[PDB]
Structure formats: structure tokens, C-alpha cells
């Protein structure tokens, strides 16, 4: 077939980032190590400080939605009742 | 063809051929690179290359001798050769210059002459040699925290900070009377030479040297050190292997004579009768390979070394070797393994029986050491004619099925891939 047009990923051999020198890895065998050493110190310190460095970005959006819902919700409440009898027709015209 | 061991308070070993035309005697310390701490590591380099200094060469020269020494895991050796009838010159030389005298050695110019030239050589072996330093770094990586995991050069962080006391201190523990052998080869009577020992009362310390405390351990590891501005990728490949003094040690060799070594250049190369070579030759999967099977006193290592242009493909070229090696388990066939017997006794015959005294007096020396006596050429042919198909499949039943690997590779190697990918290849989902 034709060739293609030009991307920005290759494949394995000529993947298509920058030339690497000096750099050393190292690893084990799974079949070498210790099976499931994460429920503690994970649950201790891990899975509590990776969502409370986040926790304000999600809670001041959701403090400021659930105020507004919830003042909406008591006004119509008063509206329909006995007593927002006179406010019902003021603010229907 | 006979060898002769005496001891009289030193174990003396002779090799006579009354055909060869020099002679070749020294001593074989049973000390080598894994008696080592990461500390000292390269002092046993240094002591070689003090042994092979100028000065200490000249006296020789003048006398008509030369001078060799080697390095290994387990021992090293110091081997003065002459001609036939002035062996009693060179047996003088090994006792004023190696075992009365040591100071005239290790003075303070001779030391820091030698000190140079030994950390320039270990910088061009580290940017220059890529096969022989990539199966360095398998022994580190499959032996690590451990006295089988050491380089035997030593390494340019460790041997700038040895001094001359550190050479002392080495000499002190290992240079003992209970951790040498003298050998003797070529064209040289076992009764003249224990007579010229004997007319002198040579001893060189009486005591027992240092226990180490941790054994050899294999694991499964890999270490992979990329380097893109080399134009080939280089890559070993082992488990865990045979020791010295195995029932299966001659079982291990054979098994990596069946698939043998190859080089793409050679047109009698490529008529070999080894099925692997059907696959790498479709596409070009490499320039050469070799097996091998690799011992020590405690433990050893069986797999294939391989250097290729075609970095696109690495991944087929692990898979198809890979492949070929279960079927060591499954189904080897009857004349694979007649093959592989033939051809492991013309390479066992060629490595013993070469025409160089200094290649004898060093495979002579280690086998002393560790078994006491040396197994002939005879009776190792007796051993290889007797195994069978079934002790084949037994043997890579236990050893190379569904087992750990260790992995070493530099270059190009972005193509190579990672661990859980070529551990799986250890077995088939078939059998």
C-alpha cells in the first residue's frame, strides 16, 4: 500500500522520542517478593492525604451548589403553604 | 597421558609430555574475585599486574623466562615458563621475587606506576567492550548482595581508594600453604620437580584463610543500561545452572551444545543441524549467538549471549529461542542428542588437549583444588556416550520449566521487552 502521513508515535524500536544515554534500571522477579504488602501503609497515610491535598476544589463547588438548592427548595415550600398566601400572587404576575 | 599428585606438606601436581618442547611450573591460590568484599574489589587485578611489572619482568628476561597470570572467581595463578632443561632457574625465580621478598615490589614508585595503568585499561573495558561487559553485569544482577555478583577487574569507584596496605592485608589472609597448589606441565618428570622443592624447605604460612558467611543465591532480576548512540543491541539471557561436583554437570553442557553457536557470516555456519536456525534466517534476527554453561564451587549459570542490527524485531528473536527451549522437556528428538554428543567431545578434546603448557598448568591447578585429584579425558567420554533422551527431559524438567530468568542488555534495546512478557515464555500453555 501507500505510506502514511506523518504522527507523533512510532512502534517498539522506533517509538519516536529523544535519544536516551546514562540512564540505569533495575527490577525483580513478582515471583520473588512479598505477596500484598499494601493494605497498611496505604490505608494509613497514602489513601488519606491523596484526596484531602484535593479535597477543597471538589467541596467549596459542592458547598456553593447545595446552598443554593436547598434555600430554593424551602422558599417554594413557603410559597404553596398557608401563610405565603399573599407573596403567591405578587410574584405570579 | 597421566597426572600425579603428591603431598608432603604441599600438594604438588605434575601433567608430563615428553613431546612438548618447553616447560611451565607456578602456584595456584584457591582465592579469587568471590572472596572479596565490595570494599577491596580489584586487589587481586592489582597484584597480577604487580607480578607483571617491568622490573620484575626483566630479571626474568635476562634469565630466559616468561611470566604469565590470570584472575577468576575462584582462583588465581602465577606461572613462569622456560625451556626443558632450566626448570631449577625458574623454580628460583616463584621463591625470591613471590614468596621471601615482597617489598621490592611494592614500593612506593613501582605501586603508583601500576596503579595507573591497571584504572586505564578497566575505562576502556567499560565504554569499548560491549559483549564481555554485558555478561559482567548478568552476574550482578542474578547473584546480587552476595561474593558471586563481584567483576573480577574490579570497578574505576573501587580502586582508587586501595593503598599498599590493602595489598598486605589480602596476602596475609589468602597466600597461605593450605590455599596453593603447585603445578608443574609440559616436559617436566613428577620426581624431579618434588626433589627440587624438597633439596629447599619452602613453606609460605601456616594457618587456614577467612570463612565468608553468605552462601551463592540465585534471583530473578534484570538490568538494562540503554544506550542509543551504539549502532547494535547486546543481550544475555540465564537461570540458574550446575556447580562443580554435580551428577548433572556433563547433562548441562550437552544440553547447550544442542543449540550451539552461529554467526551469519559464515556460509558453514548456516548448514548447521540446529532447528532454531530455520526461523532467524526468514527474517535476520541477529548477527551471532552462543550457549553456554557456566560453573563455580557453589553455584552456575545456563543460557545464550547475542548481538543484532535488526532492533524492530528483538521481540521475535526471545520468543523463537525461548521457544526451542521447551522443547528440551517436550520433545527432543533421539538425533539431536547423537549430534550434541559427537560435537561436545571434539570441544571438550580441543580445550584439554591444546599444545600450550600455560592453558594446561591453569585447568590442571583449579580441579586440584576443588575435587583433590583430576577426572581424565578417558572417563569423561564414558560419561557423555551414557546419557539418554530421558536424562535430557528430566534434567530441563527441573531446571528450565516454568523457572526464573536473568536478564542483561545494552544499546539499542528499546524494542526488548519487559519482564512478565518474556517470563511467560518459560512455559506452554500446551503441555
Known amino acids: 500500500g501507500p505510506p502514511s502521513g506523518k504522527t507523533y508515535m512510532g512502534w517498539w524500536g522506533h517509538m519516536g522520542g529523544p535519544k536516551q544515554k546514562g540512564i540505569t534500571s533495575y527490577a525483580v522477579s513478582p515471583y520473588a517478593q512479598k505477596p500484598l504488602q499494601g493494605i497498611f501503609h496505604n490505608a494509613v497515610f497514602n489513601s488519606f492525604r491523596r484526596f484531602k491535598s484535593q479535597f477543597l476544589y471538589v467541596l467549596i463547588p459542592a458547598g456553593i451548589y447545595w446552598y443554593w438548592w436547598k434555600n430554593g427548595n424551602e422558599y417554594n415550600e413557603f410559597l404553596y403553604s398557608k401563610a405565603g398566601r399573599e407573596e403567591l400572587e405578587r410574584v405570579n404576575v | ?431
Open chain 2, 1 to 431: 597421558a597421566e597426572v600425579t599428585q603428591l603431598s608432603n606438606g604441599i600438594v604438588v601436581a605434575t601433567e608430563h609430555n615428553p613431546s612438548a618442547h618447553t616447560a611451565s611450573v607456578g602456584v595456584v591460590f584457591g582465592s579469587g574475585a568471590a572472596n572479596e568484599n565490595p570494599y577491596n574489589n580489584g586487589v587481586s587485578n592489582l597484584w597480577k599486574n604487580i607480578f607483571l611489572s617491568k622490573e620484575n619482568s626483566a630479571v626474568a628476561a635476562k634469565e630466559g623466562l616468561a611470566l604469565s597470570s590470570n584472575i577468576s572467581r575462584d582462583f588465581q595463578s602465577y606461572i613462569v615458563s622456560s625451556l626443558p632443561g632450566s626448570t631449577d632457574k625458574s623454580l628460583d625465580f616463584l621463591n625470591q621475587s613471590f614468596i621471601q621478598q615482597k617489598a621490592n615490589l611494592l614500593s612506593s614508585s613501582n605501586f603508583e606506576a601500576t596503579k595507573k595503568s591497571v584504572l586505564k585499561q578497566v575505562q576502556d573495558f567499560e565504554e569499548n567492550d560491549h559483549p564481555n561487559r554485558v555478561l559482567e553485569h548478568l552476574h550482578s544482577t542474578a547473584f546480587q548482595n552476595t561474593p558471586l555478583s563481584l567483576p573480577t577487574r574490579g570497578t574505576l569507584e573501587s580502586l582508587e581508594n586501595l593503598v599498599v596496605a590493602d595489598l598486605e592485608s589480602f596476602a596475609n589472609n589468602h597466600f597461605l600453604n593450605s590455599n596453593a597448589v603447585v603445578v608443574g606441565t609440559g616436559n617436566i618428570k613428577h620426581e624431579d620437580l618434588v626433589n627440587s622443592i624438597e633439596s629447599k624447605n619452602l613453606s609460605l604460612q601456616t594457618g587456614t584463610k577467612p570463612v565468608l558467611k553468605k552462601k551463592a543465591a540465585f534471583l530473578g532480576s534484570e538490568v538494562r543500561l540503554r544506550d542509543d548512540t551504539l549502532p547494535k543491541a547486546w543481550i544475555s539471557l540465564a537461570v540458574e545452572g550446575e556447580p562443580v561436583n554435580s551428577p548433572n554437570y556433563f547433562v548441562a553442557k550437552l544440553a547447550a551444545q544442542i543449540f550451539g553457536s552461529y554467526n551469519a557470516f559464515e556460509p558453514a555456519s548456516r548448514l548447521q543441524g540446529i532447528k532454531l536456525l530455520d526461523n532467524i534466517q526468514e527474517y535476520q534476527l541477529c548477527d551471532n549467538f552462543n550457549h553456554f554453561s557456566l560453573s563455580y564451587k557453589d553455584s552456575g549459570l545456563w543460557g545464550f549471549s547475542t548481538a543484532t542490527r535488526n532492533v524492530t524485531m528483538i521481540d521475535d528473536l526471545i520468543h523463537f529461542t525461548l521457544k526451542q527451549w521447551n522443547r528440551l522437556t517436550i520433545s527432543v528428538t533421539d538425533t539431536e542428542v547423537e549430534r550434541a554428543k559427537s560435537l561436545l567431545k571434539l570441544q571438550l578434546g580441543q580445550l584439554y588437549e591444546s599444545g600450550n603448557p600455560v592453558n594446561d598448568a591453569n585447568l590442571l591447578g583449579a580441579e586440584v583444588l576443588i575435587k583433590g585429584s583430576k577426572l581424565s579425558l578417558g572417563e569423561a567420554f564414558k560419561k557423555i556416550d551414557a546419557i539418554t533422551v530421558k536424562d535430557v527431559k528430566a534434567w530441563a524438567g527441573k531446571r528450565l520449566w516454568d523457572q526464573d530468568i536473568a536478564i542483561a542488555g545494552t544499546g539499542q534495546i528499546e524494542g526488548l521487552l519487559d519482564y512478565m512478557r518474556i517470563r511467560s515464555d518459560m512455559s506452554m500453555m500446551r503441555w
